[PDB]
Structures are given as structure tokens and as C-alpha cells.
Amino acid sequence: EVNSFSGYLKLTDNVYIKNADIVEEAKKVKPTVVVNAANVYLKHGGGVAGALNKATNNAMQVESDDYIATNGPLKVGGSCVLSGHNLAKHCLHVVGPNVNKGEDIQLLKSAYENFNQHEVLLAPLLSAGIFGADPIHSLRVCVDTVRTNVYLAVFDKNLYDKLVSSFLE
Ligand SMILES: CCNC(=O)c1cc2c(N[C@H](c3ccc4c(c3)S(=O)(=O)CCO4)C(C)C)ncnc2[nH]1
Numbered sequence: 310e311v312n313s314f315s316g317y318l319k320l321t322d323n324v325y326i327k328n329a330d331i332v333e334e335a336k337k338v339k340p341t342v343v344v345n346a347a348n349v350y351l352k353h354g355g356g357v358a359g360a361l362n363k364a365t366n367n368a369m370q371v372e373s374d375d376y377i378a379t380n381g382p383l384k385v386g387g388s389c390v391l392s393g394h395n396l397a398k399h400c401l402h403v404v405g406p407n408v409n410k411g412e413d414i415q416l417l418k419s420a421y422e423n424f425n426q427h428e429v430l431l432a433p434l435l436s437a438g439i440f441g442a443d444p445i446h447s448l449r450v451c452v453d454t455v456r457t458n459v460y461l462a463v464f465d466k467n468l469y470d471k472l473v474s475s476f477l478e
Pocket residue numbers: 329330331332346355356357358360433434435436437438439440462463464465468
């Protein structure tokens with residue numbers, strides 16, 4: 310079964326959301342594309358990126374180091390397409406702004422625009438958690454920007470409930 314997403318709540322015609330761990334979603338669904346919440350040097354040291362890398366038994370990190378050696382770092386708001394390993398056909402590494410480190414929140418629109426190069430994606434909420442963006446603002450930018458089919462996995466029931474209530478107001 311291809312892109313077998315289950316238990317999502319449809320918010321708009323192309324944005325769906327679930328209270329779920331993106332790693333467990335990728336193992337079950339084996340989507341065509343999983344989005345990583347990357348940094349510009351593709352160092353997957355913790356958070357979502359560390360969890361996805363650990364689920365590949367460090368194969369994602371070795372591949373990422375080799376991409377950085379040949380191409381240099383990404384820009385904030387940018388992305389690159391690498392292997393999905395055992396989690397997906399492809400991993401789209403997207404760098405949202407880290408507001409806690411002084412990066413511009415306006416780059417969150419550029420970060421979501423990368424999603425439009427892929428017909429179907431499993432993704433986390435960009436710049437949320439320790440990147441410091443307001444997660445309700447990140448959802449609003451996702452809904453206004455992404456035009457392809459995106460399945461958002463948010464691994465926190467408290468935040469999930471706040472995002473759905475914020476959308477349905
Ligand atoms: C147990 C293994 N899995 C995880 O640790 C895991 C954590 C996951 C997660 N976290 C969200 C998140 C979204 C973006 C984001 C960050 C965290 S960060 O702080 O790592 C860096 C910047 O970008 C939180 C808001 C809830 N969302 C989705 N699936 C998950 N899986």
C-alpha cells in the first residue's frame with residue numbers, strides 16, 4: 310500500500326494533521342518523502358533530526374556529511390533531497406529559522422515553499438520546539454504556503470489539541 314496515512318484529521322484540502330511520532334509514522338507508512346527538521350550543516354544531533362537519524366542506524370548522518378563535503382551547507386529556508394533509507398523513498402531536509410538563535414521568522418515561508426516540489430509528504434511542524442517559532446503561526450504559514458499534500462505529525466497531544474482548536478476558530 311502506497312502512502313497509507315491513517316487517523317489524520319483533514320484541516321484543508323491539502324493539509325492533514327495527527328498526534329504522532331514522525332519516526333513511527335515513517336516506519337508504518339513508508340511515504341515517498343519524509344521531511345527532516347534540519348540545520349544548515351545537516352548535523353542530526355537531537356530532536357526530530359536525531360530521532361530520524363537513529364532510526365536509520367546513523368546511515369542518514371554519513372550520507373549528510375558526504376553531501377556537505379561536496380555541496381557546502383544549506384541556507385536557512387533552503388532544502389536538499391537525500392535518501393529516505395528505511396523510512397521513506399526520499400528525505401527532504403528543510404531548514405526552518407531558529408528564532409531562539411536570532412534567525413528571521415519570515416524565512417518560515419521559504420522553508421515551507423520547499424514542500425511544493427513533492428506531491429505527497431510526511432512532515433513535522435517547522436521551526437517548532439526548541440527552534441522557538443510560535444507553533445500556531447507555523448501551522449498558519451504551512452496552510453497558506455503548501456499546495457501539495459502534506460501530512461503533519463505532531464508528537465505532543467497538548468500541542469495537537471491547541472493547533473486544531475486554533476485552526477477551527
Ligand atoms: C521518540 C522519537 N521521536 C521523537 O523524538 C520525535 C519528536 C517529534 C516531534 N517534535 C516536534 C518538533 C517539531 C519541529 C522541530 C522540533 C520538534 S525540534 O525541537 O526537534 C527542532 C526544530 O523543529 C515538537 C514540537 C512536538 N514532532 C514529530 N514527531 C516527533 N518525533
